[PDB]
Structures are given as C-alpha cells and as structure tokens.
Amino acid sequence: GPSVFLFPPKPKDTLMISRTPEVTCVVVDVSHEDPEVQFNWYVDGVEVHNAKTKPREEQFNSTFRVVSVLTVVHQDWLNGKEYKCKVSNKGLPAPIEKTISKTKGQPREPQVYTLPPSREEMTKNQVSLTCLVKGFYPSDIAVEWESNGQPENNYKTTPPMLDSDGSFFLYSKLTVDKSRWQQGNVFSCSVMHEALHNHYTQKSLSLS
Amino acid sequence: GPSVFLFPPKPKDTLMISRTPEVTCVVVDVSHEDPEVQFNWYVDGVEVHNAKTKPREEQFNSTFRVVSVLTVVHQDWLNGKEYKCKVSNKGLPAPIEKTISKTKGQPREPQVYTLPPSREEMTKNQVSLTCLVKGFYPSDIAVEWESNGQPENNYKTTPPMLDSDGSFFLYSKLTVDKSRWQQGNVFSCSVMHEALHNHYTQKSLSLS
Ligand SMILES: *[C@@H]1O[C@H](CO)[C@@H](O[C@@H]2O[C@H](CO)[C@@H](O[C@@H]3O[C@H](CO[C@H]4O[C@H](CO)[C@@H](O)[C@H](O)[C@@H]4O[C@@H]4O[C@H](CO)[C@@H](O)[C@H](O)[C@H]4NC(C)=O)[C@@H](O)[C@H](O[C@H]4O[C@H](CO)[C@@H](O)[C@H](O)[C@@H]4O[C@@H]4O[C@H](CO)[C@@H](O)[C@H](O)[C@H]4NC(C)=O)[C@@H]3O)[C@H](O)[C@H]2NC(C)=O)[C@H](O)[C@H]1NC(C)=O
Ligand SMILES: *[C@@H]1O[C@H](CO)[C@@H](O[C@@H]2O[C@H](CO)[C@@H](O[C@@H]3O[C@H](CO[C@H]4O[C@H](CO)[C@@H](O)[C@H](O)[C@@H]4O[C@@H]4O[C@H](CO)[C@@H](O)[C@H](O)[C@H]4NC(C)=O)[C@@H](O)[C@H](O[C@H]4O[C@H](CO)[C@@H](O)[C@H](O)[C@@H]4O[C@@H]4O[C@H](CO)[C@@H](O)[C@H](O)[C@H]4NC(C)=O)[C@@H]3O)[C@H](O)[C@H]2NC(C)=O)[C@H](O)[C@H]1NC(C)=O
C-alpha cells in the first residue's frame, strides 16, 4: 500500500525569476517486490512531459522511495495553475492522484515593522532586533536580514501564525553584539511576498 | 494493532498550586471485537492506583478510544518524576509502555521584554504591542496579557522556537485600538515559567 506526497515550491523560488520553482511528487511504501512506477503530470488537466523522474531509492524498511520533480513557470503558479501528479503501480488496483496549487484566497500585503531592542535588554552583550510582518496572505513568505548589504547570520524567524482576521503574521529576531547596535549600524529585514510590489520590501533599523 | 499516546500536563497547570495537572494516557485503534482494556500507572516505577479511567468511546472507523487520566502532584512533576502508562489488551501479544517526565535539561530563566508599536504602525486604527520572551528552557511556558488587572482578549502568541544556543524564545502580539495606546493605557504581558521566581513575572508597557 503505497502513498504519495506532493510538495509545492518554496516561496522565494516562486518570487524571483532568477530562481527555480519545483513541484515535488514523492511516492513511498512502494512494493519491494514490484518496484515499477509510472508518473504522470498535469497543468490544469493538461498533460505535460518535462518532469525529471529520479532513481528509485531503497529504504531501510523493505520499501522504495520514488521522487518526481516538475519545474514550473513562476507566473503559472502565481496565476494559480493546478499541478496534479498521477502515480501508477502494478501492486495497486487504482493509480493515486494528488493535486496542488497556490492556496485559494485573496492576496494580502504584508506590513513590515522594525523594532528596537527593549531598554532593559541593553544589560546583555547580545541584543535583539525585531522584524514584524503582519496582515499577509497567503502564508508563503520569506524574511532575511542584512547590514551594509551583507546578509546577517544570527537571526531566526517563526513560522507564520494565523491572525484573528484570517491573515498571517510572524516575527523575525536578529541578535547582534550590543557594540554593533550602539555604534549606530543599520540593519534591515527584507521580505519577499507575492503581495509586495516587485515581491520585495525592505525596512531599516538603527539606533536613533 | 492499538497504539498509545501519553500527554503531559499543561505548563501553567503545573506552575499554579491552584490548578490541576493531569497526565493523559490515550489508547486508540483498540479492537472493535475485543474492546477490553487494562491500564497500569507508575511513579518512578512505583505503581499508584488513583487514575480515573474514562468510558471507552466508539470511533467512526470501527475502533475504540480509551483515555486514562492521572492527577499529579505539582512538585512531583517539577522535581522530574517519571510517569509510565502500561496498556494491556487481549488482542495484543504484549502490553504497551510509554513514559514521560519534565524534559531533561538545565532550567533557564526567561527574559521578558515589552516593545512599542513601530512609528509607522501609527497609521492604522489597530496597533501591535510586542511581548518578547527569550532564553528559556524548557519550552513549557505560558504568556497572557492584561490591562487594569483585566485580561486582554485580542492577543496571539507563537509556539516557542529553538534558539541557536539551545534556548527557546517566542513573541506575544497584542493588538489594541490606537486610541487606547495614545490615551496612555498600561498593558503588561505576564509570563508563567518554572525558571521564574514564583513561576511568574510581569513587564509593563505604556506610551512614554
Ligand atoms: C520507510 O521509511 C521511509 C523513509 O523514512 C518512510 O517514508 C516516509 O513516509 C511518511 C508517511 O508515514 C512521509 O510523511 C509525510 O511527510 C510529509 C513531509 O515530508 C517532509 O518531511 C520529512 C521529515 O520531516 C522529510 O524527510 C521529507 O523529505 C519531507 O521533506 C520535504 O521534502 C520535499 C521534497 O523531498 C522538500 O521539497 C521539502 O523542502 C522538505 N521539507 C523539509 C521540512 O525538509 C508530510 O507533509 C505528510 O503529512 C501528511 O500525511 C500524514 C500521514 O502520513 C498526516 O499525518 C498529515 O495530516 C498530512 O496529511 C495531509 O494534510 C495536508 C494538509 O496539510 C493535505 O493536503 C493532505 O490531503 C493530507 N493527507 C495525506 C497526503 O495523507 C507526511 O507526514 C514521509 O514523507 C516519508 N519520508 C520520505 C523521506 O519521503 C516510510 O513511512 C517507511 N515506511 C514504513 C512502513 O515504516
Ligand atoms: C480512528 O479515528 C480515531 C479518532 O479520530 C483516530 O485516533 C487518532 O490516532 C492518531 C494516530 O494516527 C493519533 O495521533 C496522535 O496525536 C497526538 C496528538 O493528539 C492530539 O491532537 C489531536 C488533533 O490534533 C487531538 O484530536 C487529540 O485529542 C490530541 O489532542 C490532545 O489531547 C490531549 C488529551 O486528550 C490533551 O491533553 C491535549 O491538550 C490535546 N491537544 C490539542 C492540540 O488539543 C500526536 O502527538 C501523535 O504524534 C506521534 O505519533 C505520530 C504517528 O501517529 C507521529 O507522526 C509523530 O512523530 C509522533 O510520534 C512521537 O513523537 C514524540 C516526540 O514528539 C515521541 O515522544 C514518541 O515516542 C513518538 N512516537 C509515537 C508515540 O509513535 C499522533 O499524531 C490521535 O491522537 C488519535 N485521535 C484521538 C482523538 O485520540 C484513529 O487513528 C482512527 N484509526 C484509523 C485506523 O483510521
């Protein structure tokens, strides 16, 4: 009894023409005696044929794992085109069909807010700078940090939370040596999200 | 083939003598033909006998569900005592054993920081006030908000995130009408966590 899992591309993959968005079709618990698999892909029901089917991998539990990767057009996904994977195995009476697309909902533009460390935080040798992203829909988003055009390393972001009003929000937290902050260095969280003009925005933060 | 799941109490249950901490032993996919179950509980291997075993509930998939609830002593769990559930069913060749205890690790005191809304946020009719809890271990924690001793309603908190240094942190976000904030009302996130003196602390925030 095999099952299939269908993964969407990653947000910023989608948002940057530069990047390569992929839809991933994963089939597990494939019969170890009859490992032969057939993938079929569809774009709004339209069969396409450009998917790279990876070599089957033997797992440690007497099953195989089978991955099919479809390259997608940025705009296509953005315009909410459907991607359906069909998987046909001889040890299964009917082929499995999963489908995925950009989540159905009105797009909503993220509001970004930079926030100092707390007065009391100025006790410790590390401070936390606070990026705040809210109101956005869907959930698919990415934040980064940087200073002097160079990306910062020591930050962490939450996974998006559902807000009362059906929007999502999240916080990003960049920690830095107090000295940097007090020297008046400028830092900015950058946010990628389909609702943004050019899918990107930057909001800066430095000690007043 | 039944399975068991063993749930810990909830943080603040543990932290307030007032509250009632419970350890929950859940057994699912119990045979619909042979539904007869036997629970056994243990405190550091020591069998106790004070658990309330709930009536078995027929599920919609031809299985039963069986819950056993053990009341625990606040200090006991706090001192990291072990709670092992044994489940014995006739349709299973060996009884299932799960065990749980306060997570193993050095306790670490949460640092709480209140943070204004962003200057730019003062555009909208709703603002966000920002409670920040960091450095804590373990993860089991709870935040609330209040003003004028009355609990606030419209806030949301993230689930704890793992921080670089093996600590957890999280943010709480309380939204309020701009007018309240500009009137100079005082708001404070309150945090319950075992590392706190008296398991509690409060940090306030009002417009300067
Ligand atoms: C033999 O050993 C095998 C290898 O270990 C093992 O295979 C594994 O099988 C499980 C199923 O039991 C399967 O689990 C699914 O995982 C989905 C996410 O997979 C992630 O994360 C894991 C680890 O965290 C990674 O190892 C995977 O590679 C994968 O990572 C992603 O991979 C893709 C491409 O490779 C990347 O693009 C991603 O970036 C990357 N992510 C990360 C974080 O790195 C998970 O979503 C599945 O959840 C759904 O099914 C569960 C039941 O299995 C339900 O509990 C749950 O509710 C989900 O249901 C769905 O919910 C959706 C809404 O959220 C709906 O849309 C769906 O309709 C609904 N239901 C479905 C589809 O049923 C799931 O947990 C693993 O993927 C798989 N391992 C690998 C490596 O492929 C075998 O089980 C072993 N067999 C036996 C018999 O023991
Ligand atoms: C027939 O229909 C039945 C009823 O719907 C159904 O029963 C369900 O079976 C599934 C297993 O498939 C079982 O899922 C487990 O759920 C655990 C959490 O349960 C929560 O959340 C659900 C919904 O979100 C609630 O409905 C539950 O009541 C329960 O809520 C909690 O309940 C307790 C007491 O009631 C409260 O105190 C809590 O406050 C409350 N929570 C909330 C949010 O309200 C989940 O933790 C389990 O995860 C582990 O097993 C998975 C495999 O099933 C793994 O993918 C996963 O990795 C986990 O593995 C563990 O990881 C741990 C570390 O994190 C380790 O410690 C463990 O060692 C390791 N492994 C284990 C134990 O295997 C799990 O998903 C449901 O609980 C159960 N439903 C109910 C209502 O009890 C049947 O499946 C149906 N049968 C069939 C054949 O279809």
Swiss-Prot record, chains A, B:
| Protein's job | Constant region of immunoglobulin heavy chains. Immunoglobulins, also known as antibodies, are membrane-bound or secreted glycoproteins produced by B lymphocytes. In the recognition phase of humoral immunity, the membrane-bound immunoglobulins serve as receptors which, upon binding of a specific antigen, trigger the clonal expansion and differentiation of B lymphocytes into immunoglobulins-secreting plasma cells. Secreted immunoglobulins mediate the effector phase of humoral immunity, which results in the elimination of bound antigens.
Extracellular topology ranges: 1-208
Stretches the record annotates as CH3: 105-208
Q: Which residues form the Ig-like domain?
A: 2-101, 110-206
Q: Does the keyword Secreted apply?
A: yes
What is the top-level taxon of the source organism?
Answer: Eukaryota
Question: Which keywords has UniProt assigned to this entry?
Answer: Adaptive immunity, Cell membrane, Disulfide bond, Glycoprotein, Immunity, Immunoglobulin, Immunoglobulin domain, Membrane, Secreted, Transmembrane, Transmembrane helix
Site, At or near the complement-binding site: residue positions: 41
Cystine residue pairs: 25-85, 131-189
Q: Which GO terms describe its cellular component?
A: blood microparticle; extracellular exosome; extracellular region; extracellular space; IgG immunoglobulin complex; immunoglobulin complex, circulating; plasma membrane
One Gene Ontology MF term: antigen binding
Q: What does the PTM comment of the record read?
A: Glycosylation on Asn-61 is required for interaction with Fc receptors and ability to activate the complement pathway.
Q: What is this protein called?
A: Immunoglobulin heavy constant gamma 2
Q: Which residues are glycosylated?
A: 61
Region (CH2) residue spans? 1-104
Q: How does it assemble?
A: Immunoglobulins are composed of two identical heavy chains and two identical light chains; disulfide-linked.
Q: Does the keyword Transmembrane helix apply?
A: yes
Q: Which gene encodes it?
A: IGHG2
Q: Which GO terms describe its biological process?
A: adaptive immune response; antibacterial humoral response; B cell receptor signaling pathway; complement activation, classical pathway
